[PDB]
Design a protein around this nucleic acid. Structure first.
Ligand SMILES: Nc1ncnc2c1ncn2[C@@H]1O[C@H](COP(=O)(O)OP(=O)(O)OP(O)(O)=S)[C@@H](O)[C@H]1O
Ligand SMILES: Nc1ncnc2c1ncn2[C@@H]1O[C@H](COP(=O)(O)OP(=O)(O)OP(O)(O)=S)[C@@H](O)[C@H]1O
Ligand SMILES: Nc1ncnc2c1ncn2[C@@H]1O[C@H](COP(=O)(O)OP(=O)(O)OP(O)(O)=S)[C@@H](O)[C@H]1O
Ligand SMILES: Nc1ncnc2c1ncn2[C@@H]1O[C@H](COP(=O)(O)OP(=O)(O)O)[C@@H](O)[C@H]1O
Ligand SMILES: [Mg+2]
Ligand SMILES: [Mg+2]
Ligand SMILES: [Mg+2]
Lengths: 320, 257, 341, 331, 330, 256
DNA sequence: GCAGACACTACGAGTACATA
DNA sequence: TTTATGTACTCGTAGTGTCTGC
């Protein structure tokens, strides 16, 4: 068993703030914090895979250098971050006396901060308020709703947005030029379409296509990784002909190996996130999709139930 | 009458042997043979491996013509050993490929007789031929000293790093409270031969281990007066506790990076 | 006690002057009790099913079933909630009801039936109001009576058949209890009053009680006792037919719905419904009474009546699958107001 | 005579199951071999799944090994996710018991033990998901037999792993030999078409037929006239509506007049018949008639189906019956 | 296990022991083999319907990478094992952090049916995967994707296991018949293809039960007739006759025909409903209202049958629904 | 009218410690011959009988027969002051709705008086149908508790197969099986450990687990416990006392 | 050595969340 | 605030063990 090569997701992880693409204003603000040194408490939020925790790690590396071994305390969901056994850890770390450069402070990376309990954040409130001169915190959560409002009242809100296609394409081309793999622009746009602004997904699909076919042409890309089924569901629900919707359902989901419950949940999510049709029509569509969802969850999962769901969706859509 | 008979001199020996590695292992696979009884068992995390072996000299009487694979459960085994007077003479009894074994908790030497039985467990995992190899180092320190050092260092960090270089043993454990650096210089004493820090040297080793697993190792220090540790960069750590007629190893897997 | 409903109850099948065919069938079962299967008596409430059960019990073993005692049993559930439910036990039988909270009566059934099955060969287990079981204790019962049967027997009493699942219907013998005829109601009331000391001008009062009771002998006896107490132990031919205050509230609600069909009247309807649900009333019977009182209003049309009955069926289906009955009842009243307007 | 006729005549051999010939032959030929798959018995109640599995276990091991190599669970027993994760897993991973010389010589003892999960459709999906890999991993030592009367409650992976044996409903043609045998053994005087009526009323089950036969025989013994049990006594004891009352219901429905049908439904429900039986009688009367139009039959079939489903939900049967009759009356 | 093979069901006897023995998923198998020969193995996520060969593929993969004793070098966790967040914090963390105990290789963690893990467990597993990915690879087998955290989905390479096509089932059946000294008629093979519905375990179970069905295991060939009695599925000719009687013949004839077909060999109304659904999907209907009415009414009937009820009323409902739906078309 | 003065405070407490788990409450009946308090468990299976003599436990003065029904939790809470030297005093006046439990200590002058509420029960049935038992067994109670807890930990069902010269205890469970056999052995030097099983008819009865635990909980009442077994009859677990004895009954559940 | 003191692991009851 | 399992967290308590001491 030979030692595995490090995956391109981790091999080409950025180590400096310049390499992170997307959200130019946020990255420039982070760079100005980096050279300025006056890091405030911040909470970083966004959709997964767009570069949240890597910016935190890069900023922690840049602000303080050889002190990175002991000047930063990183915590995560794998560590049992509770109210009692962990309040002492941050209390000691903030109370720990370590000599920094004049404009640098200790960093407490509470990575994946949306999973902590309420009491832990309640203690962290005064923990942050007391030793603000010595230590600074860095929350990195997918969802900022779990963080209580006292924590939001003393933090710098840094909202990341989903990456534009141009930035993903730019960093992808950088990766190709460092790896020297033959590429076609159609294949690259296929990767961009499949990723949906999720960068790690783009890198993983690039890995699979490169190591599966050598060439990243569009046919090989669509052979290896399938198109995202939310788009297929949205296409199916928006069709005007019932026969067309049924054919799309069967061919693209039932013959491709998709569970009925997955189709129902994706249809519910697409309907609630859809905006072209009238609001009320979306309300009855959601009600019918939920009725079919109850039928599926109660035990009867069949192509017939999905076909009936589509038939009634067309009944509401075509206005009787 | 029964094919497999193993009458211990005292139930205390088997109780101590079972309680030595009861905590760190859930499923045990005994393999009785004419040369003795062995037990190769793996932890749930598949990091710590226990290789019990009891020689024929630790049994007052022993006889087992056909090899027997006794896959068992240590929780229920210890529960069975929990009941019964410790002075009593245990006699392990099993049939030809049976569904259970019989624990003769013969009280004193007469009167009360117990027939506790534990249903045999189907463990299809074969024994692992991890005996030994060319180990880089071979040290030997008293069990009490090692247990005290491990217990002291476990409170300071979650990882204990054992370093051997130029006839010197060094334990370091950097953590949040502090960083212990307990060091030992090898020596030998004729006055008290039990306390002697023996050592061998081929190549320096710097291997780190978890704290909870090392505590699990030192829980078994009551069995042996001496513990022998052998380390290598391309081998799991070996902790050979010497018994009255056999031994009890502890193949611990070091961390990487 | 001084109540006449529990003072004159036929102890034996010989005193069951109610149904000749049903008494003969029960006597046929009691003829050879060595192989008596599990029973399930169904019919309108107030018919006297429990009376037949006790009469059959004393015909199987002998006198002494009618002596009863109370034995509170402590039962523990998930977490440490305490819902100690008493059992009305006795020699030769055992009487249980699912008066405990419906979500966790399954444990009551499980451990109590397992405890009684640890051993005159069998002890009958009467389960009053079996239609209130929540399809979970019935699942336990499926194998409970099937596995242990030579030691335990069930007389499963329920006033409705629909909530009882198919296997329970399959493994239990079905016995039908029709409601009394009006002539039989009058005869029973006449026997009670001649054993009592109430003076009657004419037996037309007994017939009026029979008509108003709608085949329910228990409420018939209760109303006769109330009238006799109110009429100074001398019934009057012009005495008004007294109704339960619940019936009065339902009829006033129906009148308010019929006359005023605005949102405000729906607010007072909701308040009245809140009071009625606070007054220990099941949702099925209140919706049934509201529906049948609405259909008895003469100013309605046949189309409105059909719409009302169809939405009543729909919302009764909703009651059978819902938790908070107030929302379903308010929705039914809203639909009725929409149809009538 | 210490037991009811349902359990007194419960089959004790695999050949005694006088229905489901395919499943019984498959299980017998498997009994000759040792390749017993993970079974999944399903079908209507009373078709004989529990009897079949008990007979199969008894013929496989014998009376001595029932307590050692059989683990039966019910909804009466606690069947949470913890029970599936610990009790079932432990019993599965234990080795098989030791067969004696007598058991091995007389019975075809196989080297596995069967875990019977009766009424398994009541378990939560999480427990079944936990049971999946327990079923898969220890296949060489234990067999799982899932006995549920509803397939849809069993999740897809278990239906994939388990071999399915549908237990067909026992109609008049399939299960007339059993009733004739029971009548011969119990000396029950019977008419010519009485057993056909019993099997017709007992919709797809034999336990109900046996119970009805026992009740009719007990009544005949009480009367003691030595008279053959007619179809009338069985029809009355079965709880089905007599034809006169059904004709009256149809006559009231045909004329309309909501007040009249409401009054007659009130009186009918006062007499207290089971509404499911009334719906069944109305279905077998209206559909089989030839005096009604095609469109009427379509609409009345849909109405009867909707009423039957609503009754099966467990609702107040009076309102459902009145609604069905009024909807039919306006056709 | 006991008595080696020949005492196991055909489901667990014919389990692939090599990546070459997995049929159908040619692209996935070839990509995985290329991955392991080139030395790179990212975090794999196998998604697909039941019976498509996910856990068989990953077991064959672990057997190929490691030695015969793959279970000594792989921490394979399933829903039977407790997988709380404490388990992730202790067992997974210790297995990922430490070095291999039997040889020199990367740790491999296989999480079969990982969709049953809680949200907090997946949240911890996120950082556990991302931190110790240098010498530890995670494989996640999930039938359902909606139960997986999107963070977990964005971390593992997604491989989709399609339902088995005709050729793969035919090849596996040919291998099984060659091994078992059994003969089977091609029409029976086509019936098995239609009965499988993309599942392989169903095929193996039906073959086992049909071999048990035959009086003489040798000599006699398995025809589609034996398939149809052994599985109990309706024959296509029966479905065609029932549908023709419903469409053209009147209520007396259609009801009598359906009752006779059901009572001939104990058919159930279920499997017959979706047999009729397949046949009607094989039709062209001018009016969409016919399709709408058919789908809605048949779904309601199938739901009611799933909840159980009276079979006669449900059969009458099926006939009425079909006959009312094919009169709005004209 | 009731003057049940008790010599030791932590003696009636020792008795109610055993009384606590056998039954929730008892209906006391005090007579000049002795104190009897029998109660029926919630299952109507386990029967507890109480008998207290007059020679010991200080002077007993029961002028009138008094029947009192009260709980044991509050009684234990009041008796928590159970010093080795403290005594007890029971006083019941006319309409004794609140019994005053006087504490007087010989070693110290400190006094303690508390009032116990009385609930309205007025229900007590005393019937001892059987006295003849096939097998009478005396053995130390601590060993009985030990063997019962060891067998009940392994299995939930306990059966006894009394044969010639063997008092066989067998416990079959899913985990395993425990078959402990004790022989009648009497040492004149150690009366407590002496074991005698009188033999008239062999007894094979299958018992439970929680009932056996409740029985063995009161092991400290007697050094030697009298165990009586009768075929097809309720068991009798008689615990001796300095003045009187306490016997426990149980139905031998059996379904084969 | 027996007694107290000591801090440790183990156990039980209570609360709060459950889709983005 | 009822809901009704399963999960996870937190605290509190009861013993159980080895460690100092006279
Ligand atoms: N803007 C970016 N520029 C370059 N690489 C990026 C960028 N965003 C993400 N990546 C790549 O994404 C991988 C890791 O992304 P992460 O920042 O760890 O994901 P994340 O933002 O933390 O989302 P979650 O919530 O943790 S799953 C590495 O391979 C990075 O190279
Ligand atoms: N094929 C059969 N042959 C003979 N008796 C049968 C048959 N099927 C059912 N029975 C009778 O049905 C009774 C018990 O059947 P069961 O096996 O309990 O039905 P079931 O499969 O358990 O239905 P459930 O569990 O309620 S879904 C006995 O009286 C049997 O004699
Ligand atoms: N492609 C295939 N080639 C050959 N046999 C297959 C194939 N797919 C499935 N099988 C058979 O199906 C049996 C069970 O399927 P598995 O692959 O073990 O489980 P699975 O397909 O992952 O389904 P789940 O999701 O785990 S329930 C195996 O033992 C094989 O005999
Ligand atoms: N044959 C009878 N003669 C006189 N009264 C009867 C007869 N049968 C029943 N009853 C009356 O019925 C009442 C009991 O009804 P009950 O069994 O409670 O009905 P339900 O079981 O529907 O609640 C008794 O008060 C009794 O007087
Ligand atoms: Mg991150
Ligand atoms: Mg059954
Ligand atoms: Mg799998």
């Amino acid at each position: 068993t030979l030692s595995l090569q490090l995956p391109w997701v981790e091999k080409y992880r950025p180590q400096v703030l310049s390499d992170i693409v997307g959200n130019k204003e946020t990255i420039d603000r982070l760079q100005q914090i980096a050279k300025d040194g006056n890091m405030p408490h911040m909470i970083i939020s966004g959709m997964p895979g767009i570069g949240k925790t890597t910016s935190v790690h890069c900023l922690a590396h840049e602000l303080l250098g050889r002190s990175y071994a002991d000047g930063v305390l990183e915590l995560n969901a794998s560590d049992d971050r509770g109210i009692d056994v962990v309040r002492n850890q941050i209390k000691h770390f903030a109370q720990k006396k370590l000599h920094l450069p004049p404009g640098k402070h200790k960093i407490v990376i509470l990575d994946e901060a949306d999973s902590m309990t309420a009491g832990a954040q309640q203690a962290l409130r005064r923990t942050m308020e007391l030793y603000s001169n010595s230590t600074r915190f860095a929350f990195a959560c997918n969802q900022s709703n779990k963080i209580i409002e006292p924590l939001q009242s003393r933090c710098a809100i840094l909202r990341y947005s989903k990456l534009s296609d141009e930035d993903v394409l730019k960093r992808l081309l950088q990766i190709i030029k460092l790896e020297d793999v033959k590429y076609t622009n159609d294949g690259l746009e296929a990767i961009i379409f499949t990723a949906e602004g999720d960068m790690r997904q783009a890198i993983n699909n690039l890995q699979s296509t490169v190591a599966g076919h050598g060439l990243v042409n569009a046919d090989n890309v669509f052979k290896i990784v399938d198109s995202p089924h939310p788009l297929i569901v949205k296409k199916m629900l928006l069709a005007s002909n019932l026969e067309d919707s049924i054919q799309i359902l069967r061919t693209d989901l039932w013959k491709k190996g998709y569970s009925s419950i997955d189709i129902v949940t994706t249809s519910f999510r697409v309907t609630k996130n859809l905006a072209q049709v009238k609001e009320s029509v979306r309300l009855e569509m959601i009600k019918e999709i939920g009725l079919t969802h109850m039928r599926i969850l109660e035990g009867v999962g069949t192509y017939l139930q999905l076909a009936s769901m589509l038939a009634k969706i067309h009944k509401l859509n075509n206005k009787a | 009458a029964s094919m497999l008979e193993a009458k211990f001199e005292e139930a205390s020996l088997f109780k101590r042997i079972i309680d030595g590695f009861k905590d760190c292992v859930q499923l045990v696979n005994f393999q009785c043979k004419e040369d003795g009884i062995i037990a190769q068992a793996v932890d749930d995390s598949r990091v710590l491996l226990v290789s019990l072996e009891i020689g024929v000299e630790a049994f007052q009487e022993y006889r087992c013509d056909h090899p027997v694979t006794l896959g068992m459960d240590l929780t229920s085994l210890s529960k069975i050993l929990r009941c019964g007077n410790n002075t009593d003479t245990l006699t392990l009894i099993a049939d030809n490929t049976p569904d259970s074994i019989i624990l003769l908790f013969e009280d004193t030497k007469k009167d009360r007789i117990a027939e506790y039985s534990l249903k045999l467990m189907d463990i299809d995992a074969d024994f692992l031929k991890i005996e030994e190899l060319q180990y880089d180092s071979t040290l030997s320190l008293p069990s009490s000293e090692f247990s005290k050092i491990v217990r002291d260092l476990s409170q300071l960090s979650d990882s204990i790093n054992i370093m051997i270089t130029k006839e010197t043993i060094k334990f370091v454990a950097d953590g949040d409270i502090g960083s212990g650096s307990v060091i030992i210089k090898p020596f030998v004493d004729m006055e008290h031969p039990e306390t002697s820090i023996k050592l061998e040297m081929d190549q320096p080793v710097d291997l780190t281990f978890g704290a909870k697993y090392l505590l699990d190792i030192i829980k078994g220090s009551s069995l042996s007066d001496r513990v022998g540790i052998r380390l290598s960069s391309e081998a799991p750590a070996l902790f050979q506790f010497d018994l009255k007629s056999g031994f009890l190893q502890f193949f611990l897997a070091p961390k990487f990076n | 006690m001084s109540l006449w409903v529990d003072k004159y109850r036929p102890k034996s099948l010989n005193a069951l002057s109610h149904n000749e065919e049903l008494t003969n069938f029960l006597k046929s079962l009691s003829d050879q009790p060595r192989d008596l299967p599990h029973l399930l008596l169904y019919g309108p409430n107030g018919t006297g099913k429990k009376t037949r059960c006790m009469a059959l019990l004393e015909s199987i073993f002998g006198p002494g079933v009618y002596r009863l005692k109370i034995d509170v049993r402590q039962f523990v559930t998930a977490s440490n909630r305490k819902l100690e439910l008493n059992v009305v036990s006795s020699p030769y039988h055992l009487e249980i009801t699912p008066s405990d909270m419906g979500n966790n009566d399954r444990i009551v059934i499980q451990e109590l039936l397992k405890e009684v099955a640890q051993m005159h060969r069998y002890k009958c287990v009467i389960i009053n109001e079996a239609n209130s079981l929540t399809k979970d204790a019935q699942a336990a019962l499926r194998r409970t009576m099937e596995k242990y049967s030579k030691n335990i027997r069930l007389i499963m009493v329920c006033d409705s058949m629909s909530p009882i699942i198919a296997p329970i219907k399959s493994r239990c013998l079905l016995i039908r209890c029709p409601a009394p005829s009006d002539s039989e109601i009058s005869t029973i009331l006449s026997d009670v009053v001649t054993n009592e000391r109430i003076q009657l001008e004419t037996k037309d009062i007994l017939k009026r009680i029979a008509q108003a009771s709608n085949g329910n002998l228990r409420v018939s006896l209760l109303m006769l006792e109330s009238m006799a107490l109110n009429n100074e132990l001398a019934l009057k031919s012009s005495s008004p037919i007294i109704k339960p205050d619940w019936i009065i509230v339902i009829h006033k609600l129906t009148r308010k719905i019929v006359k005023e069909r605005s949102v405000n009247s729906l607010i007072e309807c909701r308040a009245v419904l809140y009071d009625l649900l606070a007054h220990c009333i099941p949702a099925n019977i209140i919706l049934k009474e509201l529906t049948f009182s609405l259909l008895d209003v003469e100013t309605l049309n046949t189309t409105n009546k059909s719409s009302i009955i169809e939405y009543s069926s729909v919302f009764d289906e909703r009651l059978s699958l819902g938790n908070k009955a107030i929302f379903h009842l308010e929705g039914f009243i809203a639909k009725v107001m929409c149809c009538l307007d | 005579a210490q037991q009811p006729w349902v359990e007194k005549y419960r089959p004790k051999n695999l050949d005694e199951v006088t229905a489901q010939d395919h499943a019984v032959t498959v299980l017998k030929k498997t009994l000759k071999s040792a390749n017993l798959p993970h079974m999944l018995f399903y079908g209507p109640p009373g078709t004989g799944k529990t009897s079949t599995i008990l007979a199969l276990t008894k013929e496989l091991y014998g009376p001595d090994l029932m307590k050692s190599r059989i683990l039966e669970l019910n909804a009466s027993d606690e069947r949470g996710i913890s029970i599936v994760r610990e009790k079932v897993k432990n019993f599965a991973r234990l080795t098989v018991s030791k067969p004696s010389k007598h058991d091995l010589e007389n019975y075809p003892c196989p080297p596995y033990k069967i875990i019977i999960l009766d009424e398994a459709d009541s378990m939560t999906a999480d427990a079944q998901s936990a049971l999946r890999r327990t079923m898969e991993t220890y296949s060489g030592v234990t067999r799982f037999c899932l006995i549920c009367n509803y397939v849809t409650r069993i999740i897809d992976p278990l239906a994939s792993r388990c071999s399915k044996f549908r237990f067909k409903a026992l109609d008049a043609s399939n299960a007339i030999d059993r009733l004739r045998f029971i009548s011969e053994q119990e000396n029950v005087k019977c008419d010519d078409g009485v057993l056909e009526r019993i099997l017709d009323i007992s919709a797809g089950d034999l336990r109900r037929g046996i119970t009805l036969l026992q009740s009719a025989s007990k009544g005949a013994q009480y009367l003691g006239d030595g008279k053959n049990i007619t179809s009338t006594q069985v029809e009355e004891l079965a709880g089905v509506v007599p034809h006169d009352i059904l004709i009256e219901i149809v006559e009231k429905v045909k004329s309309g007049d909501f007040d009249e049908i409401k009054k007659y439904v009130n009186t009918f429900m006062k007499s207290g018949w089971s509404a499911a039986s009334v719906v069944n009688q109305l279905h077998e009367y209206y559909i089989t008639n030839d005096n009604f139009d095609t469109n009427f039959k379509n609409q009345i079939s849909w109405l009867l189906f909707t009423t039957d489903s609503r009754l099966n939900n467990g609702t107040n049967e009076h309102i459902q019956l009145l609604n069905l009759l009024v909807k039919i009356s306006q056709l | 296990e006991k008595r080696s093979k020949e005492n196991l069901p055909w489901v667990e006897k014919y389990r692939p022991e090599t990546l070459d023995e997995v049929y159908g998923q040619n692209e996935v198998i070839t990509t995985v083999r290329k991955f392991v020969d080139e030395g790179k193995l990212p975090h794999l996520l196998f998604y697909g319907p039941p019976g498509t060969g996910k856990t068989s593929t990953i077991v064959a993969l672990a057997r190929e990478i490691y030695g015969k004793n793959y279970s000594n070098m792989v921490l394979e966790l399933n829903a039977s094992d407790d997988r709380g967040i404490d388990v992730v914090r202790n067992q997974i963390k210790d297995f990922a952090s430490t070095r291999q105990i039997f040889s020199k290789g990367f740790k491999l963690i296989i999480l079969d049916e990982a969709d049953a893990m809680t949200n907090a467990a997946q949240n911890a597993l996120r950082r556990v995967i991302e931190r110790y990915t240098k010498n530890t690879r995670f494989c996640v087998l999930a039938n359902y994707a909606h139960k997986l955290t999107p963070a977990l989905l964005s971390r593992c390479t997604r491989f989709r296991f399609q339902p088995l096509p005709q050729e793969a089932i035919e090849r596996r059946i040919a291998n099984v018949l060659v091994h078992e000294k059994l003969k089977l008629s091609p029409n029976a093979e086509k019936a098995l293809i239609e009965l499988s519905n993309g599942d392989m375990r169903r095929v193996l179970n039906v073959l086992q039960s049909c071999k048990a069905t035959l009086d003489n295991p040798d000599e006699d060939e398995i025809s589609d007739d034996v398939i149809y009695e052994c599985c109990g599925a309706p024959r296509p000719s029966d479905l065609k006759a029932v549908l023709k009687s419903i469409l053209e013949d009147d209520w007396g004839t259609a009801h009598y025909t359906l009752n006779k077909v059901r009572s001939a060999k104990g058919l159930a109304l279920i499997d017959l409903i979706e047999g009729i659904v397949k046949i009607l999907e094989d039709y062209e209907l001018q009016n969409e209202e016919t399709r709408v009415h058919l789908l809605t009414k048949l779904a309601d009937i199938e739901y009611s049958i799933s909840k159980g009820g009276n079979d006669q009323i449900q059969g009458s409902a099926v006939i009425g629904a079909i006959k009312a739906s094919f009169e709005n078309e004209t």
